Amino acid sequence: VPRFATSDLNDLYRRVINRNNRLKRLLDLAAPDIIVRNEKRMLQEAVDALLDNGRRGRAITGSNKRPLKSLADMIKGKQGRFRQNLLGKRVDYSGRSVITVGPYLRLHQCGLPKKMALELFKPFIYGKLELRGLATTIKAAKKMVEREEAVVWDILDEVIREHPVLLNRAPTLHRLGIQAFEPVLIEGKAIQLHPLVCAAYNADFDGDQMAVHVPLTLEAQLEARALMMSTNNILSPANGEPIIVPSQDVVLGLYYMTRDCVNAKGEGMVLTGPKEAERLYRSGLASLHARVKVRITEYEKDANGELVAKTSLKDTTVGRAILWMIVPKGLPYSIVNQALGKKAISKMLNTCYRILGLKPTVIFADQIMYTGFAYAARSGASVGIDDMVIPEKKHEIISEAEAEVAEIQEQFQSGLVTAGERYNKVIDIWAAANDRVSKAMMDNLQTETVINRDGQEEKQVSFNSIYMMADSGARGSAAQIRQLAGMRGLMAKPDGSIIETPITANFREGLNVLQYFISTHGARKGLADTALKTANSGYLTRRLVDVAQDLVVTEDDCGTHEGIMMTPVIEGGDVKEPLRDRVLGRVTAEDVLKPGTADILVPRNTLLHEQWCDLLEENSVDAVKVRSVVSCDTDFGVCAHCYGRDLARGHIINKGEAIGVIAAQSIGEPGTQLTMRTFHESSIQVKNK
Amino acid sequence: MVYSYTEKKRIRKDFGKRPQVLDVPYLLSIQLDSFQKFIEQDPEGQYGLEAAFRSVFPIQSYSGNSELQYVSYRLGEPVFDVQECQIRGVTYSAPLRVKLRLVIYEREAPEGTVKDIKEQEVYMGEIPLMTDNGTFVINGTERVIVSQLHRSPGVFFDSDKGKTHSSGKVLYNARIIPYRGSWLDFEFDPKDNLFVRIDRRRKLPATIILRALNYTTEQILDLFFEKVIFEIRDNKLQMELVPERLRGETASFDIEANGKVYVEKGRRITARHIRQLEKDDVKLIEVPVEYIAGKVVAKDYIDESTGELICAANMELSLDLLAKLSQSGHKRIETLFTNDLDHGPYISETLRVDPTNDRLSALVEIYRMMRPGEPPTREAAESLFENLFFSEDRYDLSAVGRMKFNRSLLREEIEGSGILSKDDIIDVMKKLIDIRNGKGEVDDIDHLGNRRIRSVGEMAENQFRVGLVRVERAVKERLSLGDLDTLMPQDMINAKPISAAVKEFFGSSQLSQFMDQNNPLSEITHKRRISALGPGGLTRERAGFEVRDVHPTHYGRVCPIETPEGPNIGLINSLSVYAQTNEYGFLETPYRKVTDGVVTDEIHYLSAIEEGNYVIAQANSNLDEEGHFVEDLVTCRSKGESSLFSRDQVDYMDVSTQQVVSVGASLIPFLEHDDANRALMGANMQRQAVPTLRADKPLVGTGMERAVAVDSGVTAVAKRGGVVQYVDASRIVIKVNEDEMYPGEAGIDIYNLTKYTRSNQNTCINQMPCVSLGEPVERGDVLADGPSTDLGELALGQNMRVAFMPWNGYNFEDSILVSERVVQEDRFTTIHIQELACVSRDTKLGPEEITADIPNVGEAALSKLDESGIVYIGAEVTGGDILVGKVTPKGETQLTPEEKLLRAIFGEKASDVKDSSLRVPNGVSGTVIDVQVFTRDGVEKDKRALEIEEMQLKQAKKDLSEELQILEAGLFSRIRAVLVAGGVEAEKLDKLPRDRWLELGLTDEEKQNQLEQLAEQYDELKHEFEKKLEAKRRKITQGDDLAPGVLKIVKVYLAVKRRIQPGDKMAGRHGNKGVISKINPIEDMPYDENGTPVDIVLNPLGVPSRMNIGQILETHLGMAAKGIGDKINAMLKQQQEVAKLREFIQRAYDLGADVRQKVDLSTFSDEEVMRLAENLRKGMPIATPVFDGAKEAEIKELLKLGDLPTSGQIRLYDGRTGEQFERPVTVGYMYMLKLNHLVDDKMHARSTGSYSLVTQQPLGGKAQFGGQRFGEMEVWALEAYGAAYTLQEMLTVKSDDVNGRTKMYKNIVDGNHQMEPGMPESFNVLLKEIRSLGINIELED
């Protein structure tokens, strides 16, 4: 590895051979016991330097400074052999691109820039020129590729269409970080990525790089089309719900879509179905209007293997009537009538997938993306100085709290109140006053806006974009808005206790210098925490991933009678989690019983899904015995009926699927476990009697 | 006065009512001051080379009777210049002179000296110097050293208590840290015994080391312990009373004082019972015997009857022993206090457990503890005690050590020796015994009062001192070798240790590094940096808690905002704009002094310790003309907090509000509105902005950038300005005014502008003239703009049209959307300059020839390359074309008929010579700037480099001849003036030379004086100019010294124009940075009522999501600025009279309430600023202070005055469909940022190529091959996915398998689409390694 000298090896072999031939020559010379003894200690130290170096003598290489490398460093490059073997090799066929977002094309596609194209596909292009015979000799085809001929682009198009490409981000966390897409050429040096999948990768548009790998032939492209596709795997084996992020312009666009307003334009409308084209795109009809008599057709799926149609007049808005055209077939119409936030849009896709199947929730979620970006652009949402509202009560609340704290420090000057109780007391007054400024902030956030129609006292909820983001949930939070207008709260990184000098200035107002000092203090502490949690998270995923590697999950049915009782947590006044989400799935030992006896609801083990489990929700049974892992099963692995059907495929799970590797990524799935660790009785009240 | 003649071209409008009395400092005075104090001559012996020569000198050999006295030193002028040296690419260093004198003493004869030795200077090492901009030069690089922050030497009060001890008690420790040498610390254990740890070695008791200080136990107890008195005689057994020396008691029996009981048995110990016996006069009282068993004797009392050692000091007293002692003739006995309330029985466990009672056995024991291998010989222990503890050379304190030592010990004396002393360490042990006693305050590690900064001066003094000692050893051995050495300072001093220490230090170090140059901002904020890395201050590179936090000492000196947001956070810091360094290394920040009720304009610099006690008012506060504060209760801070105080409690003032921020984040307008996190992100993103083609000064700004751009040294400024004569892009000359000049040498000042040149960041830099011609220049006026500078004002990015809207989902999260208009206006386009050099030569087969033949290649390359030389300047190099031809010799072989006819028909080079050349790898294309090549010593017969050797001569003669014309012409006109009245004739003098035959004869005096003088300075200036031209030509033709491993060095510059690109990246000043999704046509952009499509499209969701306030006010205020500039532009289109526009300009300047002293038209009103209207016609330069910036009231009033709607929202129509969007939409103009993240540079797509000889894996990126990596997380992802074949052929076939790649590739080209698992070769590497280990492994079937 050249000045070469063969460092880290020949430096040791020359010393050890030097001491060997030296001890042999002096051995033939009959050197004294001190000379041959020094030759023996330098001998054992030399062979020591060979096998294990740096443990005791720490022999240094040539340029000294850093100890020389030995066989112990040859076995483990950094930590273990993971660098050399047992972990990811550099491999081949990598784009290493930069993320961009195409709104268009398909949920599973790809934007491999042309530049990226034909560089990775060179062997397939040579073989295509061979079989098709457009070239003559191998070097002639390589010349056809290197001369940038336009004929090569057609065959390249023939290859790219059905040849899938898998994408990954370097900090891979869970199984969905690597997916399979169908590439289509777009002019540019970047890759346009599906926006709904961007949050699934967690990747951001700040310019983080991206890894592009090419699968090879049968089991790679075919197993990627039957396995690794983004639409094929939607349900995440962590939360149990399907993971899709129709946030940002989808939540804002669908929130501006679904809403009502008093008066405005259009009044009532007799026309029903095709009111969007003519009414919306022509004139006279606002995008959303209250009190619309338009009838809407319904499809009842209650029939077995058949859908029963229907039509009815339901109170709705123009935007909701436009949104209903996306909803396929037999879903009920009551799902689209709401504020339609980031939450309600989830259970829509959930019931769609668990009723109509995967394709309707794929094309349906996709059309939700299209209409969300479209009507989001047509919404014209923005933010400005006049958008936020500053309450007038903030001055009286800050002055009142300042007077109360002035009385507190007056009591401290009199000596009646201790410094600690006065400290926590002042903290309590500024906290309660902060809550007051927050509540007045909200009051002026909704009920301040007025619209004049009829008795004019009915008005309407504020249309401000900040409020549309708060209620809709596209981004932001009531706490961050409380930092925008109301008080910011108090924290101290060095001390760890609430400071006695509150921040009374809103972001719109000029902040004080020391207020900025405390804000950058706590902000620096936040950056240190968020930067610190990543290493511990990845280390935990390494430990648990190394422990969970054992599960084969081989046998189908063990047939064990032992199971774990399932009861709700019932902690505090209200129960934290209901019985449905915990009981659904897996299988039930014996059978559940009604208040009447001798009758069994289920035939021994059954798969609990939206039908059977909801049928159990209508009964009074509070406990369900459910057999699961760690109970009997096999010697190595778990039978399929103990784990349950929860997976990207909600039907069943089959022999060979390893739940151990899939595990530890649900616990280790969050990148940040906690932030600040949450800064860490005689009366009993109940919600219901 | 705000005259601003240099700023009259663009007058930036100022906001805020807070005046700044203290002007912005030069701000480079940390590096400039450290350098100018590193090279200086002073009688006081300041820290530097003189301090090192005085430290080591005199150099005396052991028993040699010879000494070496220091003549100190003097620095000379370097052989090269700054610019020319950087062009040559050699380190810039001046030789050192004034060698030290020697001395000789007569052997066996005291004071006998044969002669005094004074010798000429000898060349020793090379001392690098600093450029005027604050950089260094090594091998043609910028080489700036980052400032360092380390613990100030002195006594440290530390706690080290908490849950880490788990002993249930709070531990305490203290350690003295010298500037150099071993460390001395004390350590507690739960046994409450004071221990001593020296340089991490095992802690010995205090009694063995203090015994090694030669203090007997009597001095121990009688010194660090109390005495009092004890009286045993007459059977009364009475002691003295110390009622004020203790608060407490334990009484199981009654105690009567002078016939009355002071405290009854079981009575309260309270102050009611205390003051009863305290305030009253009481004498020594008698006690019982039982209290003696708990007491401990203090002094050492032995029996006077016989000589036994019984009743020794520091021992328990026995009731049976009292009869032996008291009856031995001892009337009084000194006993220890030994009562624990505020005190403790310290040092007793050290006396009991300490095995060594003597100083000799103590020195032997500490010697055995120092060296485990060799038993102590007792001979060198005396030298190990002094040299280890108190010695001149091995102990260093000096200015900061003794200062913080004494001040940390609360001593009166502020100065002393730089060595430790027994009473000093005894005082440290006493104060530590007080800390363990519970009284006194501890010190904080993060407190900057305990921190000190080190710079190039102190660092270079340290390394140069170490090298000087390394020389002192060999010189000491040389003088000790011979008995008598005459003319010793000749061959005894070797320059290799010096030049190796300083050249290795500035050459390679963690702190010394080259800067990546993007804008002057990154250069200045990279010039001022604080580093906790390197030697000291660095514990580990992972986790950490308290070291990375923010202490209250971070307020007015270091900027909490700017920070390395990468892996190491909170370590690298940046000094304040107004921050200054004390002579001792402490950081002082200005505070305005206040006396009584008036605020005095005197400024006082306070350190952390000085400002800790004083109370300073809040930065922003109400001020009155009389100086008194308007508000009665003014917010003020004392220590670690702030509260409302009276007007009489305020000592000082914060002056400007910019003291808490740095120069990097202080240029971000509306900082108080934007969140500190996103302001941190934007400030972190200000350094990566690449300079574009044309710079447009920011219309939303601060006004500090005016001083940053001129003080950064990037722009070309003028010295002693005057009336400009000739202007040009290459050179600028100025005729200096005659008001202030030196009477000698005459002449004018000439300037040479730097053209397009490669930087360390591979960017492009140039300077362009800001003036036309005939314009006078004052002192400090910037003549030319550097990269990303406009009219001396710093602009590192470009403004463009802004509208807030989501558009068809193309803008999502932070993604950005750019119009084709700005793409087609050439904006944001930057130039990247890469340098390619092929240097090998040095062959045992004979030297290598450059070009002149290209083997095995057609005439395509011969058309680009010259016959006798390289390619034309500014050519097109695409792909693998050969830019410079090269041929290398090969081994000789037998001739044979085949190669005989081959060499006969081929001819010339015979084609047996190799084709290896400079040819460019694939993926790199562009145009070349210049080929600098190189010249060796004694090399000829090459047509290359001749064009630059002639060009530098024609340039040096071209710009040098101007001064010759001004001198010879000026003195010639002086001859025409002196020939008057001596027989003058205008018609004859204006048509002939010699000026009347050298002014003729006339009145004799003018003949010889005027003629002989005219010849004197005529031949003096002619021959002097010719001699200077020859001396300048020799420097051009001599070249530089190349490394011996090459005959000829060739280096070529190449430049590329890269432009705004879809992937790319873009950043804001408030921290918003994203990639561009797609570049849309102009027709698709929304337009206002005037039909002006929008240039940029951003995402409004990021304001609530990422908590970014400043973007809104930036865009709206910028829209107001461009509204004013748009109206003025309309006035210029209407060609209005000067006064009509002058009124709107004046109203534009003075509108609002005060907040400036500026007045329009004040200077002549008919020019200057009148043309500055045509300068700002594009946009209005509005500035806002950091925390004093504009308010929404002035924003809506100004923007309302600009005819725009007050709400800042303009009705927009869709570009594609022409329809109107619902509700008003926010538009504006904000400052944007182009970055180095462009996808052409970042992205490299690799498929198949060369691999590594080990494991057969590819090398990695930039090698044209490599698969990046998919690691163990990807292996886990595929294992969780369930597909084992992708990992099968991914981990094996495409990586380890040698036959799997050939057979697999053959299956892809053939179309079989089949692969085999094969045997991984890396697993075989593990097999071979384990087989090399003494453990055998062999596989089975």
Residue numbers in the entry:
A (entry chain D): 253 to 254, 259 to 936, 947 to 955
B (entry chain C): 1 to 1341
What sentences appear in the manuscript?
The bacterial RNAP has a core consisting of β, β′, two α, and ω subunits (Cramer, 2002, Werner and Grohmann, 2011). The major variant sigma factor (σ54) forms a class on its own and controls stress-related gene expression, including heat shock, membrane stress, and nutrient starvation genes, thus playing important roles in bacterial adaptation and pathogenicity (Buck et al., 2000). The activator proteins, which are also known as bacterial enhancer-binding proteins (bEBPs) and consist essentially of an AAA domain, use their ATPase activity to remodel the RPc into the RPo in order for transcription initiation to proceed (Ghosh et al., 2010, Schumacher et al., 2006). In this present work, using cryoelectron microscopy (cryo-EM) and single-particle analysis, we determined the structures of the RPc containing the promoter DNA from −35 to +28 with the characteristic fork junction structure of the RPc at −12/−11 (Guo and Gralla, 1998, Morris et al., 1994) and an intermediate complex (RPi) consisting of RNAP- σ54, the AAA domain of PspF (PspF1-275) in the presence of ADP.AlFx, and the promoter DNA.
The promoter DNA, although at lower resolution, is clearly visible and sits above the cleft formed between the large β and β′ subunits (also known as pincers) of RNAP. In the RPc structure, the N-terminal RI of σ54, which is the main determinant in σ54 binding to the activator protein, interacts with the ELH of σ54 RIII, and together they form a barrier blocking DNA from entering the RNAP cleft for the RNA synthesis, in agreement with the previous crystal structure of RNAP-σ54 (Yang et al., 2015). The CBD interacts with β and β′ subunits as well as the very C-terminal tail of the σ54 RpoN domain in RPc, and importantly, the CBD would block the exit for newly synthesized RNA (Yang et al., 2015). The RpoN domain directly interacts with the −24 promoter DNA. In RPc, the promoter DNA is bent between −24 and −12 and there are significant distortions downstream of −12 compared to standard B-DNA. Indeed, DNA is stretched with the minor groove widened to more than 25 Å and there is no clear density for a double-stranded DNA downstream of −9, suggesting a flexible nature of downstream DNA. There are direct interactions between the RI helix and both DNA strands downstream of −12, whereas HTH interacts with one of the strands in this region. Our structure here suggests that transcription bubble formation can be at least initiated outside the RNAP cleft in the RNAP-σ54 system.
